[PDB]
Every structure is written in structure tokens, then in C-alpha cells.
Design a protein around this ligand. Sequence first.
Ligand SMILES: O=C(O)c1ccc(-c2nn(C(=O)c3c(Cl)cccc3C(F)(F)F)c3ccc(Cl)cc23)c(OCc2ccc(Cl)c(Cl)c2)c1
Ligand SMILES: O=C(O)c1ccc(-c2nn(C(=O)c3c(Cl)cccc3C(F)(F)F)c3ccc(Cl)cc23)c(OCc2ccc(Cl)c(Cl)c2)c1
Lengths: 258, 258
Amino acid sequence: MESADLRALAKHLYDSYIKSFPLTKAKARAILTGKTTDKSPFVIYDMNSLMMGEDKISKEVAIRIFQGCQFRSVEAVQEITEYAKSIPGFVNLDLNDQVTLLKYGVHEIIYTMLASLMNKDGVLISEGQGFMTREFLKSLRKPFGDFMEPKFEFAVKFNALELDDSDLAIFIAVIILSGDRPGLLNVKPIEDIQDNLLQALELQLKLNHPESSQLFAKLLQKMTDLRQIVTEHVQLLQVIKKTETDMSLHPLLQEIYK
Amino acid sequence: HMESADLRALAKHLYDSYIKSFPLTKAKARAILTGKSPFVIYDMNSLMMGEDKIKFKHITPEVAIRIFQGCQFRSVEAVQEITEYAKSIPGFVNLDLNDQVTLLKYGVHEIIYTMLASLMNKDGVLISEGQGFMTREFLKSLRKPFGDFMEPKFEFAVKFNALELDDSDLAIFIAVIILSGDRPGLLNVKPIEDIQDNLLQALELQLKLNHPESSQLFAKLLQKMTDLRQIVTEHVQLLQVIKKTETHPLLQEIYKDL
Ligand SMILES: O=C(O)c1ccc(-c2nn(C(=O)c3c(Cl)cccc3C(F)(F)F)c3ccc(Cl)cc23)c(OCc2ccc(Cl)c(Cl)c2)c1
Ligand SMILES: O=C(O)c1ccc(-c2nn(C(=O)c3c(Cl)cccc3C(F)(F)F)c3ccc(Cl)cc23)c(OCc2ccc(Cl)c(Cl)c2)c1
């Protein structure tokens, strides 16, 4: 509740976010905004360039691309699980509650952090070596095209907040420590932690974006949506299953969705 | 540094930070073990009551596994506690971020063993911040490999405790283990060994003032840092073997580091 303590928490979480996630928003923007020879991505925009991209950087194309998403998603869950452990107080919660918070939190965090890798035209892939265009994804067959586009619609809205990684490190932690996840055993100690994180987020946003009116409230409002867009995801994912048994759902994802 | 006053200041800095990072000090633990009051777990029936009496945070929906999971739960807590303490080691946070992660990754296991000895005597171990005490013989008697898994910890602890180190000794010792320049994958060994050189100087002087009658205690303690490498090696092996013969994916991911 003391400023120096809230700033200390901001640095701790930012430091841990750098250690846990391979590809930051700062690196992503450097790649997307060019300026560079060395950091420049190969662009996948159609079938032919996809085949060349796998050479530079079988199953049906939309399925292959889907598996590429789930593979990274599984990695994100692992990365996020590792980040959570660094949130002061998280590993001291009831073990069942830790599982519960991760279970309902990872998807919201994945969307949030997927936005870092996106602009209105596409998404970084392969740790930023590749870039796949929105239009190519949107044009995939049967339901897979409509499956990719909502991610971009969110990202375009979220990125207009212009958060940097030090903002996102705290925002993500706030998302994890939500006392309103179904099935939680001890809501109060989770809310105690979130209160501290909310305080830290509030002070971080004012110092880092002093000219951004009510960014805190606007950022919390975005924590609103994620909840509904995650529902659409699992919904579309369910229907995909009921029509695509040519699909590998990783056990970690498998159990998250049960 | 190199002046006596500098080493004493460094010793005091590490002691104060050690006191803040760890819930149960050796001094408090020793008062409890020497009866100078905890619930005692000595068989199956008293185990069932102790999880009712003591609010265990790892009880997740067979006895020996349950106890194993409790060891893992507390260790994950210790990792975070050790991670915060490291930040107070002068120079640590200024090291290359990958090197900090590497040092912690290979150091936490040796430190957990070391500090577990603080909670142990020849007859059992304090648990749950000292509210409980589980007997050696009960742990030693667990089925399949779990019994052989617990007893080496006691065999180490009894040997280590004969050095009769106190908390101000241990605070520096723990720092020395963390700042080990021979961890695989380190990028910049020179500043790590520079700091470890300072910590070693301070440990040597601390042991001389705090144990003036203890012949070559410094050398004897460094020899014990020897062991820790190999006993941690045997530990991770048996930890692996448990997987190949025993045992949620999210829970698996929380504990993957161990
Ligand atoms: O790195 C990262 O943080 C990260 C994070 C997320 C994605 C990514 N996941 N995803 C999903 O549906 C998804 C999501 Cl959100 C959450 C859980 C499960 C799934 C799954 F299981 F159902 F998929 C996407 C749908 C469309 C798009 Cl554009 C991206 C995603 C991601 O994708 C990278 C990627 C790799 C390879 C190819 Cl080929 C492509 Cl196109 C994208 C990366
Ligand atoms: O407080 C503390 O500083 C502290 C610190 C350590 C233990 C404790 N860890 N542990 C391990 O194997 C172990 C170790 Cl050394 C190092 C790294 C990873 C592991 C893991 F990951 F593989 F486990 C043990 C094996 C046997 C015993 Cl006796 C204890 C340990 C510890 O155990 C407390 C405890 C034990 C049993 C129950 Cl039921 C409960 Cl509730 C608590 C406490």
C-alpha cells in the first residue's frame, strides 16, 4: 500500500514476465515496425508461400495451421503457469485453487498476449521468424477461417491502449488472481492478492501513461470482454470437434476445457 | 567487499533479508524441536487427524503419495522464498537476466535441502510453519520407493546439523550456493564469481567470530556444499523414477520444475 512497495511489486512482476515469456511486446513491435535487416520476418500470405515458409523457417492446410496454434497455446499455458508461480502469494494458496485459477485464467491471458504479436494485418509466429497475414487465416475453409478472425478483432481493440510489457506483466497477474472463478475454495486470500495487484497496476499506469485519461478503468473494461470472447472460443472449439476428429487436443488443453 | 566492516555489513544485510524471506527460522524451529505446541504425525490415524487439525493446502481430490505431494507443495513455496532472498544479494539483480534464472534453477534444490535440515532432527521434521511435526520413522516406513525417498533427507540433515550453524551463518551460506559460477549454461561467469568471492570472504569472517572455537568450520561447510551437488543428483533421479513407476496436467505443470 506504500508507493515504494507498489513500485517494487511492479519491477518484480515485470522482471518475472521477461524471464517467463520468450517473445515480448517490445521485441514483437521491433520486428513488425521493421527498421531492421536482421529481425525481419518471412511473410506467409497464401498456399505457395506457406510451403516455402516451412522450407525457410501430410494433413489439410487449415488443420496444419490449427495445430500450429494449439502447439503454441500449449506452450503459452506452460509459460503462463511458470509466470503465476512468481506472483507473490500465488503458490501459498490452496493447491486446488491454484489449479482453478490457472484453468480459467490461461485463455484470457493467451488472448491478451496474442495481441502483442498482432497488428491489423497479421500475427508473428515461430518466435517472430514468420508473420502470417490476417487475410490468409480469415480465408481458411469450413469453420477454421471464422475461428481465427475474432483473435484479430480483439487484438486491434486491445492494442489501441498502447500498453507496454511492464503494464502487461501486472495486468496478467490481476487476471490470474480472480476470486470469482467457479469452484474456488478460499476467495478472500485471492482477493487480498488481487487488491495489491490492482493497486500496483493503477500506480504503474499513471506513472507510465500520465497523459492517458482513465487508462486503468479502460484496461479493466477490457478484462470484461475477454470473458465473453473466451466463451466464443470454447464454443467454436466444441463445434469443430463435433465435425473434425482429425484433430489433436493436447491433454493440458484437454483438461482445461473439461 | 574486502574491509572487515564491509563483510560485517554484508553479513548483516543478508541476515536481515533472510529473516524477512523465510517464514520459520532455524532459531524458532530449534525451540520447537527441543520443547523449549505442534501436532504430531506418527502413523496413519494421526495423519488423517493432522490434515483435519492443520489446514493443509495441498489436499487435492493413497497416503504415501499425499505426503509426497506435500513435500512438493512446500518446495514450490521455498523456491519462491529463495527467489525473493536472492534479490537482496548485492549484485544479483544486476546480473544478466538469463544468468539469474540459471543460478536459481540449479540452486534452489541445494538450498531447499540445506534449509530443510533446519526443520529436522533425528526424530522428525517440522511442517506447516512448525504447527505440525512428522516423525522420521513414519516417513521412513512409507511403502514402495517413498520411504527410501524421505530418509536420505534425514541422513543429510543429521550430518549437516552437527555443524550447529545458526541463521546468520546460513544466510551467507545460502548466498554462496546461489552465486555458483559453474552452473551449466551461464553466460557471464566473471561477475558471478566476483560476488561469490565477496560472499565467501564474509562467510569466512562470520564463522570465525560466531564460532571461534570451531576448527576449520569454513572448510567443513564448503565440503558440505560438495555433497549437496551429488545428493541433489540422487534426489532428482529418484524423483524421475517415481514418475516412471507412480502417478492433472495443470498440476503436473505446476510441479514440472521439480
Ligand atoms: O505465441 C503466442 O503467445 C501465441 C498464443 C496463441 C496463439 C493462438 N492460439 N489460437 C487458438 O485458437 C487458441 C487460443 Cl488463442 C487459446 C487456446 C487454445 C487455442 C487453440 F488450441 F485452439 F488453438 C489462435 C488462433 C488464431 C491465431 Cl492467429 C493465433 C492463435 C498463437 O498462435 C501462433 C501461431 C503459430 C503457428 C501458426 Cl501457423 C499460426 Cl497461424 C499462429 C501464438
Ligand atoms: O519448510 C521447508 O523449508 C521445507 C523444505 C523442504 C521440504 C521437503 N522437500 N522434500 C523434497 O523431496 C524436495 C527437496 Cl528436499 C528439494 C527439492 C524438491 C523436493 C520435492 F519437490 F521433491 F519435494 C522433502 C522430502 C522429505 C521431507 Cl520429510 C521433507 C521435504 C519440506 O517438507 C515439509 C513437508 C513434508 C511433508 C508434508 Cl506432508 C508436509 Cl505438509 C510438509 C519443507
